[PDB]
């Protein structure tokens, strides 16, 4: 059933698009000390999943923050400074976010190729006999 392929590729593109938006929010918040919720932003990472047990779609089961410590900065005159003058910043790593941007885009585009190639197979089956 090549229609099941469209579900797997379609679920893959959804998963890769979630990771790209997560990467976008990490780059936009690599220097954000404050937040709406009173807790410092932590680098986010969507968790992919596979229900292997034929076609196994990839599903996003939630966003999980990185456990690395927040990068402390010595800013004693800052209004949000603690007793020792340290302000805490997100633990976003620039190099690892660029790799995620490259990986998410390439993984997104290769699933379009599979969906397009699988589309041709179904159309060719419609021509069988006739």
């Amino acid at each position: 059933s090549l229609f099941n392929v469209f579900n797997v590729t379609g679920s893959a593109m959804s998963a890769e698009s979630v990771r790209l938006n997560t990467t976008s929010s990490n780059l936009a918040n690599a220097d954000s000390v404050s937040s709406s919720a009173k807790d410092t932003y932590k680098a986010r990472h969507a968790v992919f999943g596979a229900e292997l047990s034929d076609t196994v779609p990839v599903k996003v089961m939630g966003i999980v923050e990185s456990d690395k410590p927040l990068s402390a900065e010595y800013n004693p005159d800052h209004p949000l400074a603690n007793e020792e003058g340290y302000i805490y910043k997100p633990n976003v790593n620039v190099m690892e976010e660029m790799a995620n941007m490259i990986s998410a885009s390439r993984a997104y585009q290769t699933n379009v190729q599979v969906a397009d190639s699988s589309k041709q197979m179904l159309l060719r089956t419609l021509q069988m006999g006739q």
């Binding site: 986010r44 968790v47 089961m61 939630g62 999980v64």
Partner: peptide
Amino acid sequence: GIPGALSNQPP
């Protein structure tokens, strides 16, 4: 259920 997942609703 991923243990300790972030939520999508105002704290």
